[PDB]
């Protein structure tokens, strides 16, 4: 037997991130995993800005960037007959279009990058152990029982052979899409797990720089199942094909014998659309693929899983230290379960964007080499019928971009509503523009803190860099110095750290560009209370005494006290 | 990329009043810039520009004579 604060079952990106963050806040975690190592298989690889921000908070951003492929190599999505064959056309994927890129730059100090979960996982697992988590692989969760004071789980050790018990105050179910932890907690799911009659993933190696370096992209999709994908793992060199020496399916996809090819492992994917309606069940919290299982369309899986962990850790830390009532843990479900449903529905809906491509070419699904060849030559036709076909195809191709980088709103427009956000008595604004395609910065409580550039010592710093570090932060201008004193009083009163930044001309942080003035929807003396997880929980118009009194209440409320 | 930060200050070594994003350095201005043309802003003193073009003109076939004054026609 053994005792610890949190038991994390699973060392995929959510469990690992959980361990790191809890270890960074002084909380004892034991993280476990049935397998001998981190995921070898072909899995996620698009890392969006929200996940990069979180690494930037933890100080792992420069490491990930070192191993990741940059945005600049991800831009050209090509649709073709084969890699060596003729292109139907290209879309500007992963915000490579100048305007998409501007909306990207403004939204965050971080950027897209491609980094196979294969590297991401061990990076984070090793940091978690370095920061203080205990990490044990080849250990299987067999089950647990709860009571009023905590939980007791039974583990099976695949090295020693022994079974032992672990006592803990909480359990995080971050096993994968077949989570046994979710099964025991009794969580309800909506949706199915194999939708129709899936995909085969052939990993392989081959120098394709002559076919790719003049048109750098993350993926190359072939219409030939109707569709097959060719995704880059390491620039122009290591690869998967998606669809034993029958894997010269590959040669068909590249479209040539000439390039030598070493075949790696092959595996299978199915089509899922299933999420948990509720992610918590007294003392058990479930996290990544365990509560949202979905197709790969849009990069959303890994990124959502890391953000699930970022939302929970700080709350668990506060509760375990008696700085907050257990009530605070309910906001995990309130804030996070919607995002799970959203992600699953979005990924599945992104598969509808493909059939219309075949409709534009007048093709049945799963067409035959002749029919395909007819469609290609119609496309080249110097008639008005051929012009219509061309345009139809363009309209069809463009629409696929939602699954391939265009869904910036889905990525960033979280709006929490829970006990952990204190409403300011502003009317809800909606979105001016489409909320799936476009991010809208908001400073209203429940929104994520916008990014703008300030300066510290004439050097650019992000507004977000004032704000993480496992602590609440309060932001203001010079007219708002009163918040400094009011904040101290509240930290003294309730037992919590509360950094205060007074932004302006004299100060440490100044807004040399006026972006802070412009972006906040609030006068200089107003203030934003930012959570550890970077979400605004409280906003005040000004520093009047009515505004100042509220702070102490907002805080006691947020923490359940 | 070296043209972006226009700073207003008391002196170079003194305190800044603030900065504006000059020469389309603001992300949105830069986007409108990229879409407009395949070319980009750059700083190149007329001091270098002139002789570059005078020499090309002569290379391509123009006759070029300095220290010669137009008096009238």
Pick from B16, B27, B34: CB nearest A106: B27
Q: Do A1-73+93-195+271-351 and A404-561 show the same overall fold?
A: no
Which residues on A lie below 8 Å from B16 (Cβ)? 458, 512
Tell whether residue A117 is among the known ligand binding residues: yes
Residue B25's Cβ-count burial label (10 Å; 0-12, 13-18, 19+) is: middle
CA distance A64 to A113: 9
Beta strands at A151-157 and A139-146: parallel, antiparallel or unpaired: antiparallel
The whole-angstrom separation of Cα A21 and Cα A13 is 12
Decide: helix, strand or coil at residue A112: coil
Across the beta sheet with A509-510, what order do the strands follow?
A459-462, A453-456, A509-510
d(CA A311, CA A303): 13
Of A547, A461, A446, A555, the C-alpha closest to A512 is A461
Collapsing DSSP to helix, strand or coil, A299 comes out as: coil
Count Cβ atoms below 10 Å from residue A144 Cβ, excluding itself. Answer: 23
Largest Cα separation within chain B, whole Å, is 57
Residues from B contacting A (CB-CB < 8 Å) are 15-16, 18-21, 27-28, 30-31, 34-35
B21 CB neighbours in chain A (<8 A) are 513
In angstroms, rounded to a whole number, what is the distance separating the alpha carbons of residues B48 and A484?
A: 55
Is there a contact between B35 and A99 if contact means CB atoms under 8 Å apart?
Answer: yes
List CB contacts (< 8 A) between A512 and chain B. Answer: 16, 18-19
- Only one residue has tokens 């094909």, namely A241
Buried b (16+ CB within 10 A) or exposed e, B31-62: bebbeeeeeeeeeeeeeeeeeeeeeeeeeeee
Q: Do B18 and A512 touch (CB under 8 A)?
A: yes
Q: Which two tokens stand for residue A202?
A: 């052939």
What tokens were used for A428?
Answer: 């809800």
Among the partner residues A102, A505, A513, nearest to B28 by beta-carbon distance: A102
CATH of A404-561, one of 3.40.30.120, 3.10.450.30, 3.30.2020.10, 3.40.50.2300: 3.40.30.120
Per the CB < 8 Å rule, is B31 touching A102?
yes
Option in B19, B21, B35 nearest A98 (CB): B35
The resolution in Å comes to 2.8
Cα A388 to the chain's mean position, in Å? 39
A102 neighbourhood in chain B, CB within 8 Å: 27-28, 30-31
Q: What is the DSSP string of A119-159?
A: HHHHHHHHHHHHHT-EEEESEEEEEEEE-SS-EEEEEEETT
Task: Please give the structure tokens belonging to residue B12.
Answer: 């170079």
Cross-chain CB nearest to B19 (options A102, A105, A512) = A512
Q: How far apart are CA A262 and CA A247, in angstroms?
A: 10
DSSP, collapsed to helix, strand or coil, labels residue A253 as: helix
Residue pair A198/A270 in contact by the 8 Å Cβ criterion: yes
Q: Would you call A106 and B18 a contact, using CB atoms and an 8 Å cutoff? A: no
Separation in Å, CA A64 to CA A16, A106, A126, A368, A412: 15, 21, 13, 43, 20
- Segment (H or E) for A89: strand A87-92
Cα distance from N-terminal residue to C-terminal residue, chain B:
48
Whole-number Cα distances in Å, B19 to A102, A108, A491, A515: 20, 20, 36, 11
Cβ contacts below 8 Å, chain A against chain B, sum to 25
Q: How far apart are CA A271 and CA A351, in angstroms?
A: 10
In whole angstroms, give the CA distance from residue A311 to residue A533.
Answer: 6
Q: List the single best residue of B31, B33, B39, B40 to mutate versus A (max A Cβ within 10 A).
A: B31
Which of A99, A512, A513 comes nearest B31 by C-beta? A99
A148 Cβ contact list (under 8 Å, min separation 6): none
Closest CA to A31 of A50, A5, A56, A54: A5
Most B CBs within 10 Å, among A462, A504, A513, A517, to test the B interface: A513
Extract the tokens encoding A393.
């195809």
Euclidean distance between CA atoms A175 and A157, whole angstroms:
16
Query: How far is the alpha carbon of A235 from chain B, nearest alpha carbon, in Å?
Result: 26
User: Per-domain residue ranges for chain A?
Assistant: 1-73+93-195+271-351, 74-92+196-270+352-403, 404-561
A33 vs B51: CA distance, rounded Å:
70
Strand partners, A500: A474
CA distance A85 to A134: 52
CB contact burial A118-134 (16+ within 10 A = b; e otherwise)? bebbebbbebbbebbbb
State how far the Cα of A318 lies from the Cα of A533, in Å rounded to an integer: 13
Instruction: Kindly provide the residue ranges of all beta strands, DSSP E only, lying in A147-288, ordered along the sequence.
Output: 151-157, 163-173, 189-192, 199-205, 219-223, 227-234, 238-241, 262-269, 273-276, 280-281, 284-286
Q: What angle do CA A144, A146, A149 make, to 5 degrees?
A: 135
In chain A, the residue whose alpha carbon lies closest to the alpha carbon of B33 is A98
* A102 with B27: Cβ contact below 8 A: yes
Neighbours of A412 (CB within 10 A): 21
Question: Are the beta carbons of B19 and A513 separated by less than 8 Å?
Answer: yes
Distance of CA A513 to the CA centre of its chain: 30
State how far the Cα of A327 lies from the Cα of A437, in Å rounded to an integer.
34
Q: Helix or strand or coil: residue A329?
A: helix
Torsion, Cα A473 A479 A484 A487, to 10 degrees, reads: -60
Spell out the SS3 assignment of A465-494. Answer: HHCCCCCEEEEEEHHHCHHHHHHHHHHHHC
Q: Which residue of A has its CA nearest to B18?
A: A512
Provide the token pair at A506: 């004299």
Cα–Cα dist A107/A449, whole Å: 10
Dihedral angle over CA of A413, A418, A422, A424, nearest 10: 60
Nearest to A98 among B15, B20, B34 (CB): B34
A-chain residues near B20 (CB < 8 A): 513
Torsion, Cα of A49, A55, A59, A65 (10° steps): -60
Which tokens belong to A105? 């730059």
* Determination technique for this entry: X-ray
Contacts of A289 (CB under 8 A, 6+ apart): A12, A14, A176, A177, A179, A301, A305
Which residue among B20, B21, B30 sits closest to A102, beta carbon to beta carbon? Answer: B30
CA–CA gap between residue A128 and residue A135 (Å, rounded): 8
Closest CA to A203 of A131, A267, A124, A157: A267
Instruction: Give chain B positions within 8 Å (CB) of A101.
Output: 27, 31
Q: A406 — alpha (psi -120 to 50), left (phi > 0) or beta?
A: alpha
Kindly state the tokens that stand for A7: 């038991």
Beta carbons of B16 and A458 less than 8 Å apart: yes
Instruction: Give A106's contacts in chain B (Cβ within 8 Å).
Output: 27-28
Task: Tell me the two tokens of residue A218.
Answer: 């993350």
A504, A557 contact by CB (below 8 A): no
Distance from CA of A452 to the nearest CA of B (A): 12
Q: Is the dihedral of CA A149, A171, A448, A481 positive or negative?
A: positive
Q: Are B44 and B50 in contact (CB under 8 A)?
A: no
CB A314 within 8 A of CB A25: yes
Q: B35 contacts in A (CB within 8 Å)?
A: 98-99
Q: Is the dihedral of CA B39, B45, B46, B47 positive or negative?
A: negative
String of b and e for A435-459 (b: at least 16 CB within 10 Å)?
A: bbbbbbbbbbbbbbbbbbbbbeeee
Contact A260, A248 (CB under 8 A): no
Residues in chain B within 8 Å Cβ distance of A99: 31, 35
Q: Which chain A residues have any C-beta within 8 angstroms of a chain B C-beta?
A: 98-99, 101-102, 105-106, 458, 505, 512-514
Which of A512, A514, A517 is most worth mutating to test chain B (most B CB atoms within 10 A of its CB)? A512
- Asked if B16's CB is within 8 angstroms of A512's CB, the reply is yes
Is A188:A274 a contact under the CB 8 Å cutoff? no
From A246's Cα to the closest Cα of chain B, the distance in A is 46
Report phi then psi at A553, rounded to 5: -75, -50
**DSSP string of A377-432, one letter each residue:** HHHT--SHHHHHHHHHHHHHHHHGGGGTTT-HHHHH-----STTS---SPPPP--S
Residue A256 burial (C-beta neighbours within 10 Å; 0-12, 13-18, 19+) = middle
In the structure encoding, which two tokens stand for residue A158, read together?
A: 């695949």
CATH of A1-73+93-195+271-351, one of 2.170.8.10, 3.50.50.60, 1.10.1840.10, 3.40.50.720: 3.50.50.60
Taking phi over 0 as left and psi of -120 to 50 as alpha, with beta for the rest, A476 belongs to beta
Which residues in chain B have their CB less than 8 angstroms from residue A458's CB? 16
Q: Which of B19, B30, B32 is the mutation pick for testing A, counting most A CBs within 10 A?
A: B19
Q: How far is CA A505 from the centre of its chain?
A: 36
Residue with token string 């060849």? A373
User: Could you tell me which of A336, A337, A254, A341 has the C-alpha nearest to residue A294?
Assistant: A341
């Amino acid at each position: 037997s053994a005792e610890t604060d949190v038991l994390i079952v699973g060392a995929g990106p959510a469990g690992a991130m959980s361990a790191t963050l809890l270890a960074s806040l002084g909380i004892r975690s034991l993280m476990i995993n049935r397998w001998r190592s981190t995921s070898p298989g072909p899995r996620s690889h698009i890392i969006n800005q929200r996940t990069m921000e979180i690494l930037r908070d933890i100080g792992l951003e420069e490491s990930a960037k070192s191993l990741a492929v940059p945005k600049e190599y991800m831009g050209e999505h090509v649709y073709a007959t084969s890699l060596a064959g003729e292109e139907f056309g290209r879309i500007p994927a992963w915000a490579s279009h100048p305007q998409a890129h501007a909306e990207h730059e403004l939204a965050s100090p971080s950027r897209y990058c491609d980094l196979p979960q294969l590297y991401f996982e061990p990076m984070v697992v090793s940091e978690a152990a370095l920061r203080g988590a205990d990490v044990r692989f080849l250990t299987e969760y067999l089950g647990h029982v709860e009571d009023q004071d905590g939980v007791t789980a039974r583990l099976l050790d695949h090295v020693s052979g022994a079974e032992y018990e672990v006592r803990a105050k909480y359990i995080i179910g971050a096993d994968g899409a077949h989570s046994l932890v979710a099964q025991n907690a009794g969580l309800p799911f909506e949706g199915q797990m194999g939708i129709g009659d899936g995909s085969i993933n052939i990993e392989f190696s081959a120098d394709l720089s002559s076919l790719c370096e003049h048109r750098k992209g993350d993926m190359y999709w072939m219409f030939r199942v109707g569709v097959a994908a060719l995704r880059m793992i390491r620039p122009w060199n290591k690869w998967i094909c998606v669809w034993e020496e029958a894997k010269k399916i590959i040669h068909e996809i590249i479209g040539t014998d000439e390039i030598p090819v070493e075949v790696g492992p092959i595996s299978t994917w199915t089509i899922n659309q299933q999420y948990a309606v509720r992610n918590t069940s007294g003392r058990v919290f479930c996290m990544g693929d365990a509560v949202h299982r979905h197709t790969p369309m849009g990069g959303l899986g890994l990124n959502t899983s890391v953000q699930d962990a970022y939302n929970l850790a700080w709350k668990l830390a506060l509760v375990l230290k008696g700085q907050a009532a257990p009530t605070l843990l309910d906001s995990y479900d309130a804030e996070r379960s919607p995002v799970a449903k959203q992600i699953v529905e979005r990924a599945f809906k992104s598969l509808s964007t493909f059939p219309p491509v075949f409709e534009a070419l007048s093709l049945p699904p799963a067409p035959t080499e002749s029919e395909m060849a007819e469609a290609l030559v119609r496309l080249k036709d110097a008639s008005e019928e051929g012009a219509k076909r061309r345009a139809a195809l363009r309209k069809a191709m463009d629409a696929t971009i939602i699954g391939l980088g265009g869904g910036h709103g889905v990525e960033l427009n979280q709006r929490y509503v829970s006990r952990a956000v204190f409403p300011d008595g502003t009317p809800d604004p909606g979105f001016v523009r489409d909320q799936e395609f476009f991010y809208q910065a908001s400073t209203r409580p429940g929104a994520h803190l916008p990014h703008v550039w300030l300066t510290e010592n004439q050097r650019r710093i992000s507004t977000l860099d004032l704000c993480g570090k496992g602590r609440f932060t309060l932001l203001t201008g010079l007219s708002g110095a009163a918040w400094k004193h009011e904040a101290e009083q509240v930290s003294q009163s309730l037992g919590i750290e509360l950094k205060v930044c007074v932004i302006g001309p004299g100060q440490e942080f100044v807004d040399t560009y006026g972006e802070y003035a412009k972006i906040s929807e609030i006068g200089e003396s107003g203030a934003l209370l930012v959570r550890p997880d970077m979400f605004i929980a409280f906003r005040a118009k000004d520093a009047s005494r009515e505004g100042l009194e509220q702070l102490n209440v907002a805080v006691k409320s947020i923490l359940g006290r």
